[PDB]
């Protein structure tokens, strides 16, 4: 079936430009529009524009006209969306999509999405701090001051999965993100069983295993 593969995540500073790619396969690349829509964190969908790969013609949302350029390389079945003069409110997941409407089916196809982070912040691994437990007890890890997203959190190297809650990150006013991961465990195993939270942060090659112990 038709598939759209997008380029990887990107971090950009205000004013810079970004160029996202959309690799299509499974259909005649030159016969259908590629549309681009974006979604800011926790917001709705916003349409950017489309490009017809057959003749390179385009159509842009007035909101972005003069600031966006869509391109296509037919030899590799790839369309591009370039957004210039980036501002913080351009931070979002960007999607390309197309639509095949034939006699016996009508179907939309989508890329996996590309995260573009527009921030003056610079890469920094997370500081991990224990949330020490006080029949059912709660303990966790505070993953604070990291950039950019994402971090990945597991417990006991993936063993402990029942009762785990990892909260969505929130952007602190310092430009850095922060989240907490917590787990409820039997209050009786506090002094015998050992609890380790594993925090991955690929952008910084950071890998922390912080043991959380009752203080």
């Amino acid at each position: 079936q038709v598939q759209l593969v997008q380029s990887g995540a990107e971090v950009k500073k205000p004013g810079a430009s970004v160029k996202v790619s959309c690799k299509a396969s499974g259909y005649t690349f030159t016969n259908y529009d590629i549309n681009w829509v974006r979604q800011a964190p926790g917001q709705g969908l916003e349409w950017i524009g489309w490009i017809f790969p057959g003749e390179g013609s385009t159509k842009y949302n007035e909101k972005f006209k003069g600031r966006v350029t869509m391109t296509r390389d037919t030899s590799i079945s790839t369309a591009y969306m370039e957004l210039s003069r980036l501002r913080s409110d351009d931070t979002a997941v960007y999607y390309c999509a197309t639509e095949l409407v034939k006699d016996y089916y009508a179907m939309d196809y989508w890329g996996q999405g590309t995260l573009v982070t527009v921030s003056s912040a610079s890469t920094k691994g997370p500081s991990v701090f224990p949330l020490a437990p006080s029949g059912t007890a709660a303990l966790g890890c505070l993953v604070k001051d990291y950039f950019p997203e994402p971090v990945t959190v597991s417990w006991n190297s993936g063993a402990l999965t029942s009762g785990v809650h990892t909260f969505p990150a929130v952007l602190q006013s310092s430009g850095l993100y922060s989240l907490s991961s917590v787990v409820t465990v039997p209050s009786s195993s506090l002094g015998t069983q050992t609890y380790i939270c594993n925090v991955n942060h690929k952008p910084s090659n950071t890998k922390v295993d912080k043991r959380v112990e009752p203080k």
Partner: protein, 212 residues
């Protein structure tokens, strides 16, 4: 730009129920309306084109209708997989414009949160910042109020909240309230308490500690 107003912004329903979402256009859009489904972390999925026609693979419990300015999506026989956010979209004229969206969440019995408070670690205190965490675990419905008190002074502006998506097994939520202070301001005070109210609690639940 034609504005698409969706109603309601949020909606709770039980499995098997029938739901109606509406969407008003600021101008006439004929029947050039599309409907989309989106689950967290995934791309949107098309449901309806031309206001009333289903894209291939969309089951019959999704039906759209309307013309001109008023449009509705009707989802009967709700399945657990149908609980997500839905968007209307006009494509009559440019630019294409979406509604603000409707999040549909599963109704279940009320469940009171379990409250835990966490003082900042000494490790973090060395860094100069103190973060106090209040945890509300496995509760329904989602609306829950947290109050941070330090020496009995209501805190404003220095806390952020983060709530998980609805749990896939029990349909509860959990919530996190983090109070960030300067190490100095953390040293100047003794009693730290978070107070929780919620439909599952007949009176407020308080959790507190004294620095020390």
């Amino acid at each position: 730009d034609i504005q698409m107003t969706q109603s309601p912004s949020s909606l709770s329903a039980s499995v098997g129920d029938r739901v109606t979402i509406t969407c008003k256009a600021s101008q006439n859009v004929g029947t050039n309306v599309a409907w989309f489904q989106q689950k967290p972390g995934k791309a949107p999925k098309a449901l309806i084109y031309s206001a009333s026609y289903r894209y291939s693979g969309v089951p019959s419990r999704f039906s759209g209708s309307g013309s001109g300015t008023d449009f509705t999506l009707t989802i009967s026989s709700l399945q657990p997989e149908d609980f997500a956010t839905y968007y209307c979209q006009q494509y009559n004229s440019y630019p294409l414009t979406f509604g603000q969206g409707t999040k549909l969440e599963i109704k279940r019995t009320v469940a009171a949160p379990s409250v835990f408070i966490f003082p900042p670690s000494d490790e973090q205190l060395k860094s100069g910042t103190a973060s106090v965490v209040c945890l509300l675990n496995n509760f329904y419905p989602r609306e829950a109020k947290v109050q941070w008190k330090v020496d009995n002074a209501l805190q404003s502006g220095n806390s952020q909240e983060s709530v998980t998506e609805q749990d896939s097994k029990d349909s509860t939520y959990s919530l996190s309230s983090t109070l960030t202070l300067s190490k100095a301001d953390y040293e100047k005070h003794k009693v730290y308490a978070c107070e929780v109210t919620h439909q599952g609690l007949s009176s407020p639940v308080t959790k507190s500690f004294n620095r020390g």
